[PDB]
Ligand SMILES: CS(=O)(=O)N1C[C@H](C(=O)Nc2ccc(Cl)cc2)[C@@H](C(=O)Nc2ccc(-n3ccccc3=O)cc2F)C1
Ligand SMILES: [Ca+2]
């Protein structure tokens with residue numbers, strides 16, 4: 001996360017971190033239930049083997065609440081391709097169930113039509129992760145969050161070198177130096193409605209990080225609510 | 235529903251809620267059935 005702030009205790013409980021063989025975080029995820037994590041399909045390519053860590057807020061300190069989970073099944077969307085980055089979504093079924101507690105709780109999945117008309121129309125959403133704090137810099141050792149404005153689809157297409165599909169949405173800022181970045185990929189983009197946070201996007205890609213004239217691109221979760229439901233029912 | 239979300243706490247005139255919640259008596263608010271309902275930040 002470039003800009004933004006560190007999440008306070010209990011503020012981003014649905015954050016999950018995918019860790020590679022080197023025990024280093026490389027992508028985020030969103031807790032959906034005690035057995036499932038939502039992440040980006042492209043993240044599955046970045047580490048031959050990986051595990052999932054929940055409850056962590058500081059990767060340099062082991063604190064109460066952190067726990068590691070092995071992945072039992074990976075369900076990657078069959079239409080994902082790096083050629084377009086379209087359909088950038090995967091669901092992970094964990095071998096053992098997550099115990100919800102302080103800093104570990106699922107984000108809510110909204111109903112499709114309602115989300116389309118009521119959540120996606122809000123002014124902003126919140127993105128979080130342990131990714132780079134600058135395009136060319138190091139990944140954050142602390143969990144960060146950032147409020148990102150929804151960006152008009154047409155404005156986004158005009159700004160983008162690549163095709164923005166209906167399975168994607170844009171958010172962030174034109175020139176303000178705040179954005180998600182590499183390492184945050186796969187992580188949550190949630191939108192608050194009254195007092196409940198609904199997962200609305202999956203950090204997917206961007207041309208650089210916080211670049212002037214560029215936005216953050218997210219997988220639009222509403223386009224895949226049925227796919228997620230079917231995936232979660234094995 | 236196009237107005238004040240039908241006065242609904244969550245989904246919308248008929249209000250409904252996400253898993254882990256139960257529609258309250260007033261038929262608008264949503265009540266968590268557990269200590270860690272989805273979408274709620276946690277507190278000690
Ligand atoms: C320089 S970096 O710090 O090492 N890093 C930052 C970029 C990032 O991810 N930022 C980022 C910024 C904001 C958010 Cl929300 C997520 C990621 C990342 C990248 O590679 N992005 C990227 C760019 C384009 C596509 N794409 C899109 C369509 C078609 C084909 C195609 O390849 C796919 C991508 F993976 C490289
Ligand atoms: Ca830690």
Ligand code: NA
Nearest residue numbers: 173174211214
């Ligand atoms: Na920008």
